[PDB]
């Protein structure tokens, strides 16, 4: 039964992965064909940039403002900055904005989402000058609505660009994310690729490569059928008509995912999708953002994301019926991930209970082989030798995401740290108990059996491989070869002041 299970797992994962790669390659090819036909200095589309943040590092906010000012797009109307707060501490970001941009800072005493007149003309009079708004501290979602209203009051603009306060944008990032809007009138939103600049931590590099691979394969396959669900921060585009149509339903929904942060990124895209509007994603637009360096913070963030996804699965599945022939890929990939998680759980339980050395060695060997193939593809696509480090993502995935998923399911099933980390501690204890039970059960040595010799050679080779990879990563830390070239510049500039 173990051989059948591992063979089915391998063939199913390989087939789905190959299909995703083919879809992403086709989407990239058609996007390149579309881009190759555009004329030079194309600035037909007028766009506005909206920045929202709260308790953001002044250095990062200033760098984001500079990156926005470094854009080469020649059809930028205005910049909208909204701060979710009007206190003394919230004025540091306003002062930072005054250093980089004009001193047109407004401090309204009311919130547009909670006012009778939600039009942006109540708090703004001139549309040519850039404006800064210090709204009362309500939440991330309220900040975005004010920016939408400020952008909507000017009929000259045709689209908006949504970025985070810590996002670093390239010179051509704005043009690339807004170009495909005019290519197809059915396109109302475009997603932008996000990269992690800081790679000075073991977890940071793993999550950076995971995000890069995710953007390449899942978002690429979704963009091939034009049914992307993750569009918005930290780099994305939206047409004015769709946001004007769906601003009220987005803000009238009940929000309980997080406190005073974590705006509803996926819900806006789901609202767009339920109206039958195609949404594409482009990899040419590159954005830079930081990633958590603490394992506990990463675990809780992934748990929150898992709870949000488990809440919005019903909506994202119901939104696929309008697409007709297309849209079944959403249910297909949801079932793929669900069955993958269930199969991982079942395989782990089976190997823990039966404690068969022959099957465990084959399972770890095939898992290592498929992970090495994925890392090799990542290296080939990114043209970087550091993509082979993705092989260590399996450990952090197994030790962080699975307990996070169990916690997310338990919370919504039918003491602050008890509901956050106790489940993870119990999972770790169970894993350790299963491992010790397995090793004590098969505690013997017999060099006269080829199967035992094969299992020992396989496990020794796996241990040697992981040890040498860890040694190489450790050597890269002192050599600073693993450091992102953009990260080094930021470190030097921070050292300067």
């Amino acid at each position, epitope marked *: 039964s173990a051989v059948w299970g591992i063979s089915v797992y391998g063939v199913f994962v390989l087939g789905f992965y190959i299909a995703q790669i083919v879809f992403s390659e086709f989407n990239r090819m058609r996007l390149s064909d579309w881009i190759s036909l555009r004329p030079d*200095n194309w600035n037909a589309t007028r766009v506005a940039v909206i920045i929202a943040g709260y308790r953001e590092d002044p250095f990062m906010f200033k760098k984001c403002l*500079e990156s926005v*000012r*470094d*854009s*080469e*797009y*020649g059809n*930028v*109307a*205005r910049l909208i900055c909204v701060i979710d707060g009007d206190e003394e501490e919230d004025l540091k970001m306003a002062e930072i904005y005054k250093q*980089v*941009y*004009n001193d047109n800072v407004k401090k309204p005493g009311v919130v547009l989402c909670e006012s009778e007149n939600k039009n942006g003309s109540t708090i703004d009079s001139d549309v*040519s*000058k*850039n404006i800064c708004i210090l709204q009362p501290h309500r939440g991330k979602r309220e900040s975005l609505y004010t920016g939408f209203q400020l952008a909507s009051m000017d009929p000259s603009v045709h689209a908006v660009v949504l970025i985070d306060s810590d996002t670093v944008l390239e*010179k051509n990032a704005i043009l690339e994310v807004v170009y495909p809007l005019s290519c197809d009138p059915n396109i109302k939103a475009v997603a932008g690729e996000c990269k992690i600049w800081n790679t000075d931590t073991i977890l940071s590099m793993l999550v950076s490569w995971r995000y890069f691979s995710a953007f390449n394969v899942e978002r690429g396959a979704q963009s091939l059928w034009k049914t992307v669900q993750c569009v918005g921060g930290p780099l994305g585009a939206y047409t004015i008509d769709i946001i004007n149509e769906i601003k009220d339903p987005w803000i009238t929904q009940t929000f309980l995912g997080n406190k005073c942060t974590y705006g509803d990124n996926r819900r806006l895209t789901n609202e767009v999708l339920m109206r039958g509007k195609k949404i594409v994603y482009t990899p040419f637009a590159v954005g830079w953002s930081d990633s958590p360096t603490n394992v506990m913070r990463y675990i809780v963030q992934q748990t929150r994301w898992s709870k949000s996804w488990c809440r919005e699965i019903w909506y994202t599945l119901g939104s696929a019926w309008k697409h007709g022939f297309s849209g079944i890929y959403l249910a297909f990939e949801c079932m793929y991930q669900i069955m993958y998680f269930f199969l991982v759980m079942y395989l782990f339980s089976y190997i823990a209970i039966k404690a068969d050395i022959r099957a465990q060695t084959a399972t770890v060997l095939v898992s290592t082989l498929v992970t090495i193939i994925k890392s090799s593809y990542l290296a080939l696509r990114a043209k970087n030798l550091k993509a082979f480090y993705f092989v260590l993502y399996t450990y952090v995935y197994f030790f962080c995401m699975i307990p996070a998923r169990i916690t997310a399911m338990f919370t919504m099933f039918d003491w602050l740290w008890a509901k956050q980390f106790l489940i993870t501690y119990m999972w770790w204890a169970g894993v350790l108990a299963a491992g010790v039970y397995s090793i004590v059960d098969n505690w013997y040595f017999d060099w006269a059996d080829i199967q035992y010799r094969f299992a020992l050679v396989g496990i020794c080779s796996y241990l040697v491989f992981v040890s040498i990879v860890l040694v190489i990563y450790l050597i890269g830390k002192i050599t600073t070869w693993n450091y992102t070239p953009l990260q080094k510049e930021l470190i030097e500039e921070r050292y300067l002041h």
Partner: nanobody
Amino acid sequence: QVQLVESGGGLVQAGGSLRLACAASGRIFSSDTLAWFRRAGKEREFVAASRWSGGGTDYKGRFTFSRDNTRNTMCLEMNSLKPEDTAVYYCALRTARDSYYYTRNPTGYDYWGQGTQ
């Protein structure tokens, strides 16, 4: 924040050509608007402007705008001369912090540089 220094000039007959170079030392964010002005007893008139990223606006067919984008140096060579083009040229910079609108009004150019001709 930024200082503009002009190079080139001299006395040139009606037949010939010359090159005017404006130098800067600092960061201009590659988004500011750069323009040229001809006359100082008359008010300054627009000559040519173009964004650092790209583009170009005349008013010509005889004067072209060129940049370097790596040396923070710019040039505007003039083909052929006429008696009424002889004046003190100025190198000006317009900041995009206040607004992104493109205007030919010299009052919007807060920063100016000393002339040479």
